[PDB]
DNA sequence: CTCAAGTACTTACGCCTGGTCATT
RNA sequence: AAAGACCAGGC
DNA sequence: TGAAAGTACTTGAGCTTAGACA
């Protein structure tokens, strides 16, 4: 009965399907929760699920409560027959039973229609499993043959067969990926007040020092000003490291991968040496500072006394040194860990040994390892991606690897600088100024009439403003063209884009010269009607004798004019931008992350724009669009606009997105190696025959990859 | 088989009762090789001479004698794809064709007759290769299969009363696919034919038994509706390898 | 993008020939004697005759007189300058002739609307 | 073996082809002879063809067998002996009270302005055959034979079947237009009602037809090689059962 | 390069360990004199492992740098990973 | 409209002066942060039939190391720049005896214009920049990392430290937007410093060819 | 809006302009025939195409056994209780899930949307 | 002579088991 | 028997 | 009965002129 309003960006059918899917998914989730709540502790399904050996909660839901909605190609079961799913159903039945929602569970048994719909649903998984494997294997082979010769030389510089430098140090830190673990910086995020309370080592208290430090060391700490100066220097260096971290890690992501687990070995030192937190420690804080400073010298990724070598070593070990100084802070040692001196020495020794073990072994075949570590998750990745829709999984990985000139769904996320970021009206204004709106999108109907004299007005409603306009010293006396093009502008589309007839007429004049008459109904009416003629006459001259053959009679000339206006008018926005979406993100990667006056990380919900089709240059040039955060998923235009290093970063981001979308994790060094070998020769080298054989490698290297005889002929 | 097009491989709504949904090979040929359902029958072919002769005898109009001005309201008549003419009273023509096929006087039970009401076309197919399955016939809200038919079939031995006599009695009808498009089926008679909360009242056919949609290998599965469909497919493809 | 130059050439060649011979036809008329038009001798807006601007000024004057016999303003002497200033504002805000006329007609309605709203037509 | 159903009209839409909507009819004549002769009737998308298309999407064209490239639908209709545009429209459009479909078929009429005679239409088609005839009459004969025999043989093959062919082609164009209006759903290839199954019967028939044709060809060759003497002829040594067996 | 100014890791890579153990085991199985004393060890692989643990393997590893130079590290000079 | 072109000119001038500052040329601090109103007052608002004619918007700057080489920014008035325009503008170029200058095209250049631009390498060097490309500072984008142009001594030290021949380094074509931004010719090496989530900071060197 | 045909050669009439009198003329280019154009309009384009479907809806659709029918909404003309309903059933119909009812019972054929 | 807009090549998982058939 | 093709099947 | 795409080729087009000074 048409009470369902269309959600913006979706047709009424799309919104209806979304509502039905939401209802059915909520029902299935509620039934699954109710069923799992009813399982006793002795239930074997629950015993298997909680152990994680096999099965899941949705498996118990399907077995016990409800199988759930069956989907074909990411949508509810289609109408294979004429507007009906099966002959048993009436035509145009969108109910849950007719469209494939299985009310029964596996235990209860499916009804025949539900059985057939479940067969259709399982056919999707069967086809995906059978068909994605070939393309995944081909992708793995291409990646391998691209990276097969990339290796870590004995100076730890990652180089290919031609000794060309791919990375100065493997993983940009020079260490292998087997020994690293996840760790928290614990310096990035803490409120400035909390940071100072946690890492300052306030020695003025004279009671906390007695409680935590031994009685002998308290007098030494207080009396000597050199102790206090060194401690304040340590805290200043830690604050500088905090600033460096906040520069390196926006969005406040404190989970990082580092070679050795500081907290775990601190705990091991506590247990090995029988450390009692209830008692004051015998560890001198200056001894902690000196041990940290000395240990930082023995953790060498880049050896050498050159200033270049010193800077390379500092940059390679910067993050790990920051984390180590954060965890090995004097105040943390005295307050939380309470480590003893001998325990601290043993901990330093273990840190040095484990970090030296974690260093990547020269001679390690890093290229093939990274290619396999990239291709292996592709096997478990779905071939399908199914209201912004972006290609994910194997097809998106293929698009990124080949750098397809025309991606299937090229999108361009947009961030807003000023008040448009927060206010919805200005965000909609930017939306309308970015979305391509030609004349056809706004006019309701257009027609070509015949008006031999303007005052005639063969259309009745136009008499008023027509007799208003032609009663001035105008060109009516001469042969005003009797052919009239009358267009009707749709009020809804008129006000949706905040367009007005003055803007449209200005665009018409700019595009078609001053020799085209445009007359409109200054709104405040009932039909946003616009009248346009093709006035040329002959400037009041003698008739017309022997007119040129290609006169293009005004009726069909008006035909061409109307077609050109309806097709290529570009009233607003930027071309190759089919549709722009607008929403407030709930995920932190698209949220605005700022540093408060307290130093904390807070996320602001600001309107962002996702576009179908990409034009990065003009969108970035556009007013009030954030030039720093705006980016697109396709790589070719990023190469043509922002450069090659921006391509490196954006390609790394796209690969990380397509890999971690399903929740999987792949160590960063493999992604970095792939992006570096693609962005190495200065241009976007594709992982394929054209680009792998375009390198200046050996002919026998190329002849093993997809060309053989051709490469040997060229050689 | 090397083609990556995943659309032809998909199980279609159009395969209901026609091809077994669960049973299909695994590998590069999934979905592209299909085995017949239990009740599925292939049209063998027939010469469309008697149907054309009856249509000529049943009024209608040829294309050579037709007036192009009076063809808009009338319904086109197609026989084996060729256009033979138009008819101004599709309802009675279809009713008489159905009666003749039910009693098997001029039209054999293999021939399929379709009335596409929205598009005003009537298609009659006598071609070979069409896939069809038998279905019970429903008049009003009651089956045409009565107690006496079952009583005579119980004594099928030494009676000379068989499936052919049941079909010739106008009780069961062979309905192919594109005629199944214009049919409305009932799953079981004791549930969907009797009066309840009104869903449909224009039932014209009722399935013999829903288990007939399964193939030869998928029919041996006990309680196949309690299984995940991929596992039914696996068991179907594996039963051919069972040893005995 | 290829069709853009194609359509531009086609349109320009098929409507240029429509102009015919002797395409000079400018004959810019100066303000005759007493045009109440600030910067009247202005060629910024092509094909905007001085008499057309005078006609728009008279239309604005009739609108202001209708507002006068709906709200009882001071007199007509200041209304003449009011109409002149409104016409000059519209002229500055306009770039092409038809847009200028459209803006002139848009003001006239606003006025009449205020007269229907019975309120004086303020700035 | 699965295959598309023969002698019926299908409408499909390709995503990147120069055709917006394509109608085809895989046609075979009673399975008596020839594998299949299939005909396409399509609409030329939206991109301009130089000077005529400036509307909602039109220019229906045909792809005849043994013709290298497209042929306008109105030219093909005129090649069947239908000169006046009203008769062609009556065959294509069944009711003239619907103006939108007429508006869409209008520029197809506009293209065939130049060709206004049946014989010149036949020459237009014949000049676009497999090989252009040197003389006008050879092209006329070739085009007439292609239109009569190979193009849509299921409706008719012999002589006066021209009216039936025109009616069926009009039905094809009507279905294509109905797809263009969106009044009919695009036909689904995977819909099994559009598929026929070639079992032992049809497969062995297709085999035996060609095999018996080869047997007859060999018999003719032997007869020709043995008749030049003029002595006599005997069938028993002229037949090689090895062929069929 | 010269013995002075050697730049590689003093740790021996696992690949160097594997290859040196294989080579030493092959030499031992081909009647080469054993360096460490053997306590009833008939298997050359365990003999080579014991030799490595005692840093007595008479092999120097020539580490080729990517620029074409090389550096000679004795197994005793390299410090065992295990 | 006219205000749109005024904002376009202001943004282009701001980006151009930031570009000149990044290349080591003496740019006053006030000029780098120039508000739209300040630029409007300085150059006279509307450019169409107004004070700024796209001439006298040109910028002359001097390099910090030596004030003699200088650099002098360009703004042709024509939508498409031709041989005559660059010819008279090079007559100015030789009159002022400077060598380095830019090119700010509205839409595009004739092929003869490009050929004449590349004709003299040693005498005068001129770089062609589109109007659209200057509407944003690509170096300020979050994807683009910090680029530093290395002197010849730094390049020699870098090659001696890692014992690399010149072609063994990673490459960056001279047509790269960032390479064009710094006006880098073939044979130079750009030092690239980008943050990493494994090491914290990573320095990459890209030879320009 | 529509298409008019010649009466001599039955070809299509194209719009022509009568220069001497300034009236719209429909002149066939196959011959010399010219006729007065009554509507004075040539081309109408409803790109948003707010077209009514009931003009494209045929009455015999009510004979379909596969279509649902309710007695809730009666006929406006004949007041018959039972009526068959269905959706747009048409492509390019924008976004429309509205219901098009057709009255059952013979010879009625009435249709209405709500 | 010299730029964008049409026509040709070239490739689509890893094995593993077997059975059949026409040429040689 | 040799390599060639085809087919079916396992993961 | 229904690839899909990337790359290496061609081919056509096609744009003011005037003499003095310069
Ligand atoms: Zn005529
Ligand atoms: Zn009624």
From Swiss-Prot, chain A:
Subcellular localization(s) per the UniProt record: Nucleus; Cytoplasm; Chromosome
Ranges where the record places region Bridging helix: 111-152
Chain residue ranges for the region called Trigger loop: 362-397
PTM per Swiss-Prot/TrEMBL: The tandem heptapeptide repeats in the C-terminal domain (CTD) can be highly phosphorylated. The phosphorylation activates Pol II. Phosphorylation occurs mainly at residues 'Ser-2' and 'Ser-5' of the heptapeptide repeat and is mediated, at least, by CDK7 and CDK9. POLR2A associated with DNA is specifically phosphorylated at 'Ser-5' of the CTD by CDK7, promoting transcription initiation by triggering dissociation from DNA. Phosphorylated at 'Ser-2', Ser-5' and 'Ser-7' of the CTD by CDK9 (P-TEFb complex), promoting transcription elongation.
Sequence position, cross-link Glycyl lysine isopeptide (Lys-Gly) (interchain with G-Cter in ubiquitin): 541
Outcome after substituting residue 48 to T: In NEDHIB; uncertain significance; severe
Binding residues for DNA template strand: 689
Tree of life domain: Eukaryota
Mutagenesis / variant outcome for changing residue 397 to P: In NEDHIB; mild; decreased cell viability
Binding site for DNA nontemplate strand: 694
Disease (UniProt): Neurodevelopmental disorder with hypotonia and variable intellectual and behavioral abnormalities: An autosomal dominant neurodevelopmental disorder characterized by profound infantile-onset hypotonia, developmental delay with poor speech, delayed walking, and impaired intellectual development. Additional variable features include feeding difficulties, dysmorphic features, and visual defects.
Domain notes: The C-terminal domain (CTD) serves as a platform for assembly of factors that regulate transcription initiation, elongation, termination and mRNA processing.
Name of the gene: POLR2A
Curated annotation (Swiss-Prot), chain C:
UniProt-reported outcome of changing residue 106 to E: Abolishes interaction with POLR2A
Tissue: Ubiquitous.
Consequence of changing residue 7 to A: Abolishes interaction with POLR2A
Impact upon substituting residue 100 to A: Reduces interaction with POLR2A
Outcome following mutation: residue 18 to E: Abolishes interaction with POLR2A
Ranges where the record places region Interaction with POLR2A: 1-123
Annotated region described as Plays an important role in affinity and substrate choice in DNA binding, given as residue ranges: 1-112
Record annotation: effect of changing residue 101 to E: Abolishes interaction with POLR2A
Residue stretches spanning the membrane: none
UniProt note: domains: The alpha-helix immediately C-terminal to the Zn(2+)-binding site (residues 438-453, characterized in C-terminally truncated contructs) is required for helicase activity, is positively charged, and may play a role in DNA-binding and choice of substrates.
Description of how the protein assembles with itself and partners: Monomer. Interacts with TOP2A, TOP3A and TOP3B. Isoform beta interacts with RNA polymerase II subunit POLR2A. Identified in a complex with the RNA polymerase II core bound to DNA. Interacts (via C-terminus) with POLR1A. Isoform beta interacts with RAD51. Interacts with WRN; this interaction stimulates WRN helicase activity on DNA fork duplexes. Interacts with MUS1; this interaction promotes MUS81-dependent mitotic DNA synthesis.
Family from the record: Belongs to the helicase family. RecQ subfamily.
Protein's UniProt name: ATP-dependent DNA helicase Q5
UniProtKB/Swiss-Prot annotation, chain F:
Sorted UniProt keywords: Acetylation, DNA-directed RNA polymerase, Host-virus interaction, Isopeptide bond, Nucleus, Transcription, Ubl conjugation
Family statement drawn from the similarity comment of this UniProt entry: Belongs to the archaeal Rpo5/eukaryotic RPB5 RNA polymerase subunit family.
A Pfam family: RNA_pol_Rpb5_N
Species of the source: Homo sapiens
ATP-binding as UniProt keyword: no
Cellular localization per UniProt: Nucleus; Nucleus, Nucleolus
Predominant location: nucleus
Cross-link (Glycyl lysine isopeptide (Lys-Gly) (interchain with G-Cter in SUMO2)) at residue(s): 80
Disulfide bonds: none
Gene Ontology biological-process annotations: protein stabilization; transcription by RNA polymerase II; transcription elongation by RNA polymerase I; tRNA transcription by RNA polymerase III
Function: DNA-dependent RNA polymerase catalyzes the transcription of DNA into RNA using the four ribonucleoside triphosphates as substrates. Common component of RNA polymerases I, II and III which synthesize ribosomal RNA precursors, mRNA precursors and many functional non-coding RNAs, and small RNAs, such as 5S rRNA and tRNAs, respectively. Pol II is the central component of the basal RNA polymerase II transcription machinery. Pols are composed of mobile elements that move relative to each other.
Keyword Transcription recorded: yes
Name of this chain's protein: DNA-directed RNA polymerases I, II, and III subunit RPABC1
Gene3D superfamilies for this protein: RNA polymerase, Rpb5, N-terminal domain (3.40.1340.10), RPB5-like RNA polymerase subunit (3.90.940.20)
Cellular component, GO annotation: cytosol; nucleoplasm; nucleus; RNA polymerase I complex; RNA polymerase II, core complex; RNA polymerase III complex; RPAP3/R2TP/prefoldin-like complex
From Swiss-Prot, chain G:
GO MF, any single term: DNA-directed RNA polymerase activity
Protein's GO biological process: maintenance of transcriptional fidelity during transcription elongation by RNA polymerase II; transcription by RNA polymerase II; transcription initiation at RNA polymerase II promoter; transcription-coupled nucleotide-excision repair
Keyword Transcription attributed: yes
Any one cellular-component term (Gene Ontology): RNA polymerase II, core complex
Residues annotated for Zn(2+) 1 binding in this entry: 6, 9, 28, 31
Ranges annotated as spanning the membrane: none
UniProt entry tagged with the keyword Nucleus: yes
Keywords: Acetylation, DNA-directed RNA polymerase, Metal-binding, Nucleus, Transcription, Zinc, Zinc-finger
Subcellular localization: Nucleus, Nucleolus
Binding site for Zn(2+) 2: 75, 78, 103, 108
Coiled coil: none
Mapped zinc finger ranges (C4-type): 6-31
Zinc finger (TFIIS-type): 71-113
A Pfam family recorded for this sequence: Zn_ribbon_TFIIS
SUPFAM superfamilies: Zinc beta-ribbon (SSF57783)
Domain of life: Eukaryota
Matching InterPro entries: DNA-dir_RNA_pol-M_15_CS, Rpa12/Rpb9/Rpc10/TFS, Zn_ribbon_RPB9, Zn_ribbon_RPB9_C, Znf_TFIIS
Assembly: Component of the RNA polymerase II (Pol II) core complex consisting of 12 subunits: a ten-subunit catalytic core composed of POLR2A/RPB1, POLR2B/RPB2, POLR2C/RPB3, POLR2I/RPB9, POLR2J/RPB11, POLR2E/RPABC1, POLR2F/RPABC2, POLR2H/RPABC3, POLR2K/RPABC4 and POLR2L/RPABC5 and a mobile stalk composed of two subunits POLR2D/RPB4 and POLR2G/RPB7, protruding from the core and functioning primarily in transcription initiation. Part of Pol II(G) complex, in which Pol II core associates with an additional subunit POLR2M; unlike conventional Pol II, Pol II(G) functions as a transcriptional repressor.
Protein name listed in UniProt: DNA-directed RNA polymerase II subunit RPB9
């Amino acid at each position: 009965n048409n009470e369902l309003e269309p959600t913006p960006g979706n047709t009424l059918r799309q919104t209806f399907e979304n509502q039905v899917n939401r209802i059915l998914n909520d029902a299935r989730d509620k039934t699954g929760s109710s069923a799992q709540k009813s399982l006793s502790e002795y239930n074997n399904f629950k015993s298997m699920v909680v152990s994680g050996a096999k099965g899941s909660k949705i498996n118990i839901s399907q077995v016990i409560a409800v199988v759930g909605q069956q989907n074909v190609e990411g949508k509810r079961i289609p109408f294979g027959f004429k507007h009906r799913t099966l002959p048993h159903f009436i035509k145009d039945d969108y109910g849950p039973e007719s469209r494939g929602f299985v009310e029964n569970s596996y235990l209860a048994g499916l009804t025949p229609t539900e059985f057939f719909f479940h067969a259709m649903g399982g056919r999707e998984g069967l086809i995906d499993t059978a068909v994605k494997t070939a393309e995944t294997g081909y992708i793995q082979r291409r990646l391998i043959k691209s990276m097969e010769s990339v290796m870590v030389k004995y100076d730890a510089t990652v180089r290919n067969s031609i000794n060309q430098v791919v990375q100065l140090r493997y993983g940009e830190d020079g260490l292998a990926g087997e020994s690293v673990e996840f760790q928290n910086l614990a310096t990035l995020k803490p409120s400035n007040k909390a940071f100072e309370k946690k890492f300052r080592f306030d020695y003025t208290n004279e009671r906390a020092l007695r409680r935590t430090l031994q009685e002998d060391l308290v007098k030494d700490v207080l009396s000597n000003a050199h102790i206090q100066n060194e401690l304040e220097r340590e805290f200043e260096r830690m604050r500088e490291d905090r600033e460096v971290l906040r520069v390196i890690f926006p969005t406040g992501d404190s989970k990082v991968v580092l070679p050795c687990n500081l907290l775990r070995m601190i705990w091991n030192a506590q247990k090995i040496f029988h450390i009692n937190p209830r008692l004051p420690s015998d560890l001198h804080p200056i001894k902690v500072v000196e041990g940290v400073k000395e240990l930082s010298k023995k953790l060498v990724i880049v050896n050498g006394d050159d200033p270049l070598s010193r800077q390379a070593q500092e940059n390679a070990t910067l993050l790990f040194n920051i984390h180590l100084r954060s965890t090995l802070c004097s105040r943390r040692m005295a307050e939380e860990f309470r480590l003893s001196g001998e325990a601290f020495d043993w901990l330093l020794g273990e840190i040095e040994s484990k970090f030296n073990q974690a260093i990547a072994h020269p001679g390690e075949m890093v290229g093939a390892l990274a290619a396999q570590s990239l291709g292996e998750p592709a096997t478990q990745m779905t071939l399908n991606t199914f209201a912004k829709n972006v290609t994910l999984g194997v097809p998106r990985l293929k698009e990124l690897i080949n750098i397809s000139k025309k991606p299937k769904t090229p999108s361009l996320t947009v961030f807003l600088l000023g008040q448009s970021a927060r206010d919805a009206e200005r965000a909609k204004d930017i939306l309308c100024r970015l979305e391509h709106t030609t004349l056809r999108k706004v006019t309701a109907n257009t027609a070509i009439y015949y008006d031999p004299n303007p005052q005639s007005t063969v259309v009745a409603e136009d008499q008023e403003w027509v007799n208003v306009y032609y009663e001035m010293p105008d060109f009516d006396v001469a042969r005003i063209s009797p052919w009239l093009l009358r267009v009707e502008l749709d009020r809804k589309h008129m006000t949706d884009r905040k367009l007005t007839m003055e803007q449209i007429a200005e665009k018409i004049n700019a595009g078609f010269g001053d020799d085209l008459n445009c007359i409109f109904n200054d709104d405040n009416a009932e039909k946003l009607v616009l009248r346009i003629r093709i006035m040329n006459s002959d400037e009041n001259k003698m008739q017309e004798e022997e007119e040129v053959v290609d006169k293009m009679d005004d009726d069909v000339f008006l035909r061409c004019i109307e077609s050109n206006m309806l097709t290529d008018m570009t009233l607003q926005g930027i071309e190759q931008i089919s549709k722009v979406y607008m929403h407030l993100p709930q995920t932190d990667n698209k949220k605005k992350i700022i540093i408060t006056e307290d130093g904390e990380f807070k996320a602001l919900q600001e309107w962002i724009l996702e576009t179908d089709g990409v034009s990065l240059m003009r969108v970035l040039s556009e007013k009030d669009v954030d030039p720093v955060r705006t980016t697109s998923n396709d790589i070719v235009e990023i190469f043509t606009v922002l450069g090659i290093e921006a391509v490196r970063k954006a390609l790394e981001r796209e690969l990380y997105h397509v890999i971690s979308f399903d929740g999987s994790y792949v160590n960063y060094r493999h992604l970095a190696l792939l992006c570096d070998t693609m962005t190495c020769r200065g241009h976007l080298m594709a992982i394929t025959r054209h680009g792998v054989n375009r390198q200046d490698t050996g002919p026998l290297m190329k002849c093993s990859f997809e060309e053989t005889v051709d490469v040997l002929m060229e050689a | 088989r090397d083609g990556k097009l995943a659309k032809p491989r998909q199980l279609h709504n159009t395969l209901w009762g026609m091809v077994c949904p669960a049973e299909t090979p695994e590998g590069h040929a999934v979905g592209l090789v299909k085995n017949l359902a239990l009740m599925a029958y292939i049209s063998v072919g027939s010469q469309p001479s008697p149907i054309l002769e009856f249509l000529e005898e049943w009024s209608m109009e040829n294309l050579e004698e037709i007036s192009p001005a009076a063809i808009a309201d009338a319904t086109k008549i197609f026989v084996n794809g060729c256009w033979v003419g138009i008819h101004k009273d599709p309802e009675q023509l279809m009713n008489t064709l159905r009666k003749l096929r039910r009693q098997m006087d001029i039209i054999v039970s293999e021939v399929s007759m379709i009335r596409d009401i929205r598009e005003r076309e009537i298609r009659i197919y006598t071609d070979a290769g069409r896939i069809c399955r038998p279905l019970l016939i429903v008049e009003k809200q009651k089956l045409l299969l009565k107690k006496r038919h079952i009583d005579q079939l119980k004594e099928r031995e030494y009676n000379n009363y068989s499936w052919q006599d049941l079909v010739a009695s106008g009780v069961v009808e062979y309905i192919d696919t594109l005629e199944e498009e214009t049919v409305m089926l009932a799953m079981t008679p004791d549930d969907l034919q009797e009066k309840e909360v009104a869903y449909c009242s224009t039932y014209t056919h009722c399935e013999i038994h829903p288990s007939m949609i399964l193939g030869v290998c998928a029919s041996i599965i006990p309680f196949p509706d309690h299984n995940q469909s991929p596992r039914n497919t696996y068991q179907s493809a594996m039963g051919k390898q069972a040893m005995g | 993008e290829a069709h853009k130059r194609e359509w531009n050439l086609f349109y320009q060649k098929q409507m240029q020939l429509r102009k015919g011979k002797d395409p000079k036809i400018e004959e810019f008329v100066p303000p005759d004697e007493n045009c109440p038009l600030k910067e009247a001798s202005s060629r910024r807006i092509p094909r905007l005759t001085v008499k057309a601007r005078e006609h728009c000024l008279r239309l604005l004057e009739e609108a202001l007189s209708s507002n006068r016999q709906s709200t009882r303003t001071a007199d007509e002497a200041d209304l003449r300058a009011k109409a002149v200033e409104l016409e000059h504002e519209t002229f500055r805000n306009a770039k092409v002739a038809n847009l200028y006329k459209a803006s002139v007609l848009k003001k006239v309605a606003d006025i009449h609307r205020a007269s229907k709203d019975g309120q004086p037509y303020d700035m | 073996q699965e295959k598309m159903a023969t002698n019926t009209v299908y409408v499909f839409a390709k995503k990147d082809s120069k055709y917006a909507y394509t109608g085809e009819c895989r046609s075979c004549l009673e399975n008596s002879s020839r594998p299949t002769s299939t005909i396409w009737v399509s609409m030329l998308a939206r991109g301009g063809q130089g000077a005529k298309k400036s509307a909602i999407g039109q220019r229906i064209v045909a792809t005849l067998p043994y013709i290298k490239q497209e042929v306008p639908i109105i030219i093909v209709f005129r090649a069947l002996g239908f000169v006046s545009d009203r008769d062609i429209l009556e065959h294509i459009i069944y009711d003239f009270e619907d103006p939108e479909m007429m508006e869409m078929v209008k520029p197809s009429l506009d293209e065939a302005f130049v060709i206004q005679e049946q014989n010149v239409a036949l020459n237009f088609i014949g000049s676009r055959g497999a090989k252009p005839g040197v003389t006008k009459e050879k092209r006329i004969k070739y085009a007439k034979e292609v239109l009569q025999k190979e193009m849509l043989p299921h409706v008719g093959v012999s002589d006066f079947c021209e009216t039936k062919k025109a009616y069926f082609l009009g039905y094809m164009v009507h279905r294509l237009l109905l797809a263009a209006l969106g009044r009919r759903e695009l036909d689904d290839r995977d819909h099994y009602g559009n598929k026929r199954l070639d079992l032992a019967g049809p497969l062995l028939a297709f085999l035996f037809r060609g095999m018996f044709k080869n047997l007859l060809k060999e018999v003719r060759i032997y007869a020709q090689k043995f008749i030049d003497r003029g002595k006599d002829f005997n069938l028993e040594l002229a037949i090689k059962t090895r062929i069929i067996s | 390069q010269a013995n002075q100014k050697r730049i590689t890791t003093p740790y021996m890579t696992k690949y160097e360990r594997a290859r040196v153990l294989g080579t030493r085991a092959l030499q031992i199985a081909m009647c080469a004199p054993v360096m460490v004393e053997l306590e009833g060890e008939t298997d050359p692989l365990l003999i080579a492992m014991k030799e490595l643990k005692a840093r007595k393997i008479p092999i120097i590893i020539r580490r080729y740098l990517p620029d074409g130079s090389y550096e000679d590290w004795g197994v005793d000079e390299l410090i065992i990973t295990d | 409209d006219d205000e749109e072109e005024t904002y376009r000119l202001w943004k282009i001038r701001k980006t151009i002066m930031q570009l000149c500052h990044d290349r080591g040329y003496l740019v006053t601090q006030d000029e780098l942060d120039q508000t739209l109103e300040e630029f409007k007052a300085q150059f006279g608002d509307k450019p169409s039939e107004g004070r700024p004619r796209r001439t006298d918007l040109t910028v002359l700057v001097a390099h910090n190391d030596d004030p003699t080489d200088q650099m002098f920014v360009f703004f042709p008035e024509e939508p498409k720049v031709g041989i005559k325009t660059i010819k008279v503008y090079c007559q100015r170029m030789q009159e002022e005896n400077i060598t380095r200058a830019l090119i700010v095209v509205q839409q595009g250049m004739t092929p003869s214009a490009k050929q004449s631009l590349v004709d003299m390498a040693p005498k005068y060097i001129l770089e062609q920049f589109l109007q659209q490309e200057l509407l944003i500072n690509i170096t300020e984008h979050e994807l683009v990392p910090e680029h530093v142009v290395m002197t010849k001594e730094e390049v020699t030290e870098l090659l001696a430290r890692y014992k690399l021949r010149e072609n063994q380094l990673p490459r960056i074509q001279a047509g790269d937007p960032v390479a064009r931004y710094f006006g880098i010719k073939r044979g130079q090496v750009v030092k690239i410093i980008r943050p990493s989530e494994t090491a914290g900071r990573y320095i990459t060197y890209r030879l320009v060819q | 809006v529509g298409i008019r045909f010649c009466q001599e050669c039955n070809n299509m009439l194209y719009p022509k302009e009568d220069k001497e009198n300034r009236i719209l003329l429909y002149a066939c280019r196959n011959c010399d025939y010219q006729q007065e154009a009554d509507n004075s309009c040539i081309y109408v384009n409803k790109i948003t195409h707010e077209v009514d479907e009931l003009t494209q809806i045929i009455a015999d659709v009510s004979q379909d056994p596969t279509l649902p029918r309710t007695e809730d909404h009666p006929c406006q003309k004949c007041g018959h209780k039972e009526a068959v309903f269905f959706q747009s059933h048409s492509a390019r119909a924008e976004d429309a899930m509205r219901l098009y009812y057709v009255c059952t019972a013979p010879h009625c054929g009435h249709r209405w949307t709500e």
